[PDB]
Amino acid sequence: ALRVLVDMDGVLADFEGGFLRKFRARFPDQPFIALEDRRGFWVSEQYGRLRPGLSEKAISIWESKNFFFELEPLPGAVEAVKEMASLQNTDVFICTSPIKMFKYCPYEKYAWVEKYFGPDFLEQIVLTRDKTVVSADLLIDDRPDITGAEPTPSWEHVLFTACHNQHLQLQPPRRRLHSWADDWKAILDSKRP
Amino acid sequence: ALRVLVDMDGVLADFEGGFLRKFRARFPDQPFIALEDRRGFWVSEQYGRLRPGLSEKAISIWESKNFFFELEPLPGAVEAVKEMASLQNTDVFICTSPIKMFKYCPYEKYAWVEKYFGPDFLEQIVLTRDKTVVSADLLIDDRPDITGAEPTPSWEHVLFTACHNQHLQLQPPRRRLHSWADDWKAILDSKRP
Numbered sequence: 001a002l003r004v005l006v007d008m009d010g011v012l013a014d015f016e017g018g019f020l021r022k023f024r025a026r027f028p029d030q031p032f033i034a035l036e037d038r039r040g041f042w043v044s045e046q047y048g049r050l051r052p053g054l055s056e057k058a059i060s061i062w063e064s065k066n067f068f069f070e071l072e073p074l075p076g077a078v079e080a081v082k083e084m085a086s087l088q089n090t091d092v093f094i095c096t097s098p099i100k101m102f103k104y105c106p107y108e109k110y111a112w113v114e115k116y117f118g119p120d121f122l123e124q125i126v127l128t129r130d131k132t133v134v135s136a137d138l139l140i141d142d143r144p145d146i147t148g149a150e151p152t153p154s155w156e157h158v159l160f161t162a163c164h165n166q167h168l169q170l171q172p173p174r175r176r177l178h179s180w181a182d183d184w185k186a187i188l189d190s191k192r193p
Numbered sequence: 194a195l196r197v198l199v200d201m202d203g204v205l206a207d208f209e210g211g212f213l214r215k216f217r218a219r220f221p222d223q224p225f226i227a228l229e230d231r232r233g234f235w236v237s238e239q240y241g242r243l244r245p246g247l248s249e250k251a252i253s254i255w256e257s258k259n260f261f262f263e264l265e266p267l268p269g270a271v272e273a274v275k276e277m278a279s280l281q282n283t284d285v286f287i288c289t290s291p292i293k294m295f296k297y298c299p300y301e302k303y304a305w306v307e308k309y310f311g312p313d314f315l316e317q318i319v320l321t322r323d324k325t326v327v328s329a330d331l332l333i334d335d336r337p338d339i340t341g342a343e344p345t346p347s348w349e350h351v352l353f354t355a356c357h358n359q360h361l362q363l364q365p366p367r368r369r370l371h372s373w374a375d376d377w378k379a380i381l382d383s384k385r386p
């Protein structure tokens with residue numbers, strides 16, 4: 001069976017839009033970064049450059065109760081993953097790294113998966129900071145630099161497009177999934193025997 | 194680097210003793226199973242055979258708030274894993290499956306790891322129901338039957354002895370770690386290049 005790992009934040013759940021909305025509501029007198037002007041993976045770093053103390057204020061949004069639970073799905077994400085999981089000879093796992101503050105985030109990610117995919121899909125969740133030690137054919141993740149304890153992961157990393165990575169030139173033969181409307185079936189098929 | 198996955202319940206944390214203590218306290222008029230009389234991996238199944246309704250009462254102990262957090266370490270477990278992690282060319286991850294009710298268990302497992310191993314060790318946690326998709330040289334786990342989506346896991350499963358598995362005849366060349374006092378360094382060394 002083909003095995004596909006799907007990232008959660010920025011791939012299934014709209015982390016960037018949820019963050020921005022809550023930041024602006026909580027900190028209406030601070031400057032912010034429009035989604036179109038996001039550059040680089042780390043939200044907090046971009047905000048820290050924008051003004052002193054803004055990194056810590058950004059962090060405070062995602063460390064808050066209900067931040068993860070209340071993220072809206074990306075367009076097409078829930079439908080695509082449900083279809084993907086239902087395909088013959090195809091195992092799908094949601095492989096997600098929780099933030100360092102653990103009071104809410106792990107719990108909310110399970111709750112979010114239950115909400116959008118149902119109880120039986122909880123079995124498909126892998127929470128890990130290191131995705132390199134999870135073996136699979138494909139990893140669909142918006143982070144450009146995925147590293148860890150395994151220097152040669154078994155998966156091919158397909159870069160899921162986001163605001164923060166859309167201008168990046170990747171090294172051949174690295175590939176992208178532009179959105180869930182893009183042809184994810186063709187990418188899966190290219191790895192099948 | 195050698196990669197070792199270490200199970201949590203029944204290997205690092207004394208699930209069986211914690212369960213029994215809390216069961217007897219909450220249900221003092223019910224029969225129970227002494228640790229020495231534990232047979233088979235699933236606590237709940239053994240209790241359900243003992244009397245009608247006891248499976249659900251057992252489950253209610255581990256679904257309760259603070260059950261996971263308040264488990265005591267096994268003798269030698271914290272010291273061994275700290276030493277193991279500090280060895281040259283050795284990466285250690287705690288690979289643990291949370292129960293199906295997710296309100297407390299994921300959170301408490303992170304909190305427990307922080308308590309006994311410190312904040313930096315949180316990075317070494319993998320929460321998953323399927324350990325077969327986690328690649329490693331060794332998996333030290335008290336469950337006899339470890340299966341999942343990967344039919345040929347990369348790890349060798351070393352069976353950690355517990356009450357419930359101590360009489361089991363394993364198929365050659367399956368091996369055991371009897372306790373943390375047993376010679377876990379020799380087992381690791383047998384897998385090094």
Ligand SMILES: Cc1cn([C@H]2C[C@H]3O[C@](c4ccc(C(=O)O)cc4)(P(=O)(O)O)OC[C@H]3O2)c(=O)[nH]c1=O
Nearest residue numbers: 009010015041042043044045096097098099100129
């Ligand atoms: C931890 C962390 C996260 N973020 C943004 C970027 C993105 O990263 C992750 C993330 C979470 C944890 C780690 C880690 O423990 O190293 C890394 C990335 P994702 O990989 O998408 O889940 O967390 C949610 C998002 O939050 C950020 O801007 N700064 C941070 O310090």
Ligand SMILES: Cc1cn([C@H]2C[C@H]3O[C@](c4ccc(C(=O)O)cc4)(P(=O)(O)O)OC[C@H]3O2)c(=O)[nH]c1=O
Nearest residue numbers: 202203208234235236237238289290291292293322
């Ligand atoms: C879920 C479950 C667990 N247990 C006992 C046995 C042992 O199993 C695990 C466990 C937890 C979840 C699953 C699962 O989702 O399939 C399986 C085993 P462990 O692997 O040691 O963490 O949970 C803690 C312990 O709890 C039990 O007796 N019956 C159960 O239905």
Ligand SMILES: [K+]
Nearest residue numbers: 007009010142
């Ligand atoms: K992400």
Ligand SMILES: [K+]
Nearest residue numbers: 085086087090
């Ligand atoms: K399937």
Ligand SMILES: [K+]
Nearest residue numbers: 200202203335
């Ligand atoms: K166990």
Ligand SMILES: [K+]
Nearest residue numbers: 278279280283
């Ligand atoms: K080490």
